[PDB]
Design an enzyme around this catalytic site. Structure first.
Site, PDB file in Angstrom:
ATOM      1  CD  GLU A  11      -2.982  -1.018   0.159  1.00 32.20           C
ATOM      2  OE1 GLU A  11      -3.748  -1.894  -0.090  1.00 32.20           O
ATOM      3  OE2 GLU A  11      -3.010   0.122  -0.471  1.00 32.20           O
ATOM      4  CG  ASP A  20      -8.203   3.901  -4.497  1.00 38.90           C
ATOM      5  OD1 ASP A  20      -8.607   2.786  -4.338  1.00 38.90           O
ATOM      6  OD2 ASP A  20      -8.138   4.797  -3.555  1.00 38.90           O
ATOM      7  CG  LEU A  32     -12.001   4.328   0.036  1.00 41.03           C
ATOM      8  CD1 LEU A  32     -11.385   4.850  -1.250  1.00 41.03           C
ATOM      9  CD2 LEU A  32     -13.062   3.286  -0.279  1.00 41.03           C
ATOM     10  CG  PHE A 104      -6.094  -3.786   4.009  1.00 41.29           C
ATOM     11  CD1 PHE A 104      -5.536  -2.909   3.065  1.00 41.29           C
ATOM     12  CD2 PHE A 104      -6.089  -3.384   5.345  1.00 41.29           C
ATOM     13  CE1 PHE A 104      -5.072  -1.640   3.456  1.00 41.29           C
ATOM     14  CE2 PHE A 104      -5.589  -2.154   5.724  1.00 41.29           C
ATOM     15  CZ  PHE A 104      -5.097  -1.267   4.792  1.00 41.29           C
ATOM     16  CB  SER A 117     -10.261 -18.585  -5.599  1.00 45.85           C
ATOM     17  OG  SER A 117     -10.280 -18.089  -6.920  1.00 45.85           O
ATOM     18  CG  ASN A 132     -10.434 -19.929 -10.057  1.00 48.29           C
ATOM     19  OD1 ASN A 132     -11.032 -19.162  -9.242  1.00 48.29           O
ATOM     20  ND2 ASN A 132     -11.004 -20.370 -11.151  1.00 48.29           N
TER      21      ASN A 132
END
Length: 164
Positions: A11, A20, A32, A104, A117, A132
């Site tokens: 991040e 973003d 965010l 997250f 998945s 996948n």
């Protein structure tokens, strides 16, 4: 290596409101603020989040405080989620961090949509699940990060982050 160090690689750290990969208003370590187009809505959310008048800028301290809240909320969300919880419980400690990382980035809801998945991860079919997971918007939009997470699920080791 731990979840905090891992997410902080993925991040980054920014002390000024930013956009973003998505174009959304964010601050700190991937926190965010709003999906709304106004810097002004964003500024407002920021001050609500911190409890002061920030004018679009926070300290390291405040960034880490938001980061500790986000990680806690991610883990608790996983544990409350009927789709997520069973997968989480079934995994080892390193793979547990890879699911936390997805939650997250994309929220509970988003990850819970990766039905097939999740199913494979629970079955411990690592190579199949990695193939996948790659078939997603997620991987196409943020391939270097998705690939780190994916290698983490494949191997159960921290190597993808060693480099970094």
């Amino acid at each position: 290596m731990n979840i905090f160090e891992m997410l902080r690689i993925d991040e980054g750290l920014r002390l000024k409101i930013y956009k973003d990969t998505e174009g959304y208003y964010t601050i700190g370590i991937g926190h965010l603020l709003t999906k709304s187009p106004s810097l002004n809505a964003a500024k407002s959310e920021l001050d609500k989040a911190i409890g002061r008048n920030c004018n679009g800028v926070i300290t390291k301290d405040e960034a880490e405080k938001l980061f500790n809240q986000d990680v806690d909320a991610a883990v608790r969300g996983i544990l409350r989620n009927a789709k997520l919880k069973p997968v989480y419980d079934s995994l080892d400690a390193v793979r547990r961090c890879a699911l936390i990382n997805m939650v997250f980035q994309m929220g509970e809801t988003g990850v819970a949509g990766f039905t097939n998945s999740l199913r494979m991860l629970q079955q411990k079919r690592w190579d199949e699940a990695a193939v996948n997971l790659a078939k997603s918007r997620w991987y196409n939009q943020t391939p270097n990060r998705a690939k780190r997470v994916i290698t983490t699920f494949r191997t159960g080791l921290w190597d993808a982050y060693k480099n970094l």
